Amino acid sequence: KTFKQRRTFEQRVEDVRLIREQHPTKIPVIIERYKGEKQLPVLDKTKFLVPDHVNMSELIKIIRRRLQLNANQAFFLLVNGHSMVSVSTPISEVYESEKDEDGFLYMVYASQETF
Ligand SMILES: COC1CCN(C(=O)NCC2CC2)CC1
Numbered sequence: 001k002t003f004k005q006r007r008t009f010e011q012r013v014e015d016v017r018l019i020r021e022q023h024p025t026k027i028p029v030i031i032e033r034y035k036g037e038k039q040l041p042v043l044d045k046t047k048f049l050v051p052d053h054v055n056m057s058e059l060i061k062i063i064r065r066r067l068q069l070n071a072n073q074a075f076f077l078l079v080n081g082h083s084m085v086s087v088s089t090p091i092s093e094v095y096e097s098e099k100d101e102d103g104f105l106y107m108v109y110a111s112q113e114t115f
């Protein structure tokens, strides 16, 4: 069901190396609905190539637009299993400190802060 379940560590590592080769300015991001989630839709896809200069605050706006949310729906975005310390950090900086050992940056969203 989840991305890590669908692809071998080898396949995830090689895909990241290829994004490096072909999409060198992009951060490879996996974005997944919380398995417990009732309110928010699932995304049309899992793997997002994010320009490396956008900050976390803009990536939240992008995903809320991708989900076609309205002003008073709640949306929480976990990175590498935990709350974002700050929405102002550029995603290039977030990648270097929060990337998985496979080379992807793993995110999960819910309507609840208590996932
Ligand atoms: C904000 O992230 C989304 C942008 C679209 N995307 C791309 O693949 N980018 C376009 C270009 C061919 C690589 C990943 C999802």
Ligand SMILES: [Cl-]
Pocket (backbone or CB within 6 Å): 022, 023, 024, 025, 026
């Ligand atoms: Cl690029």
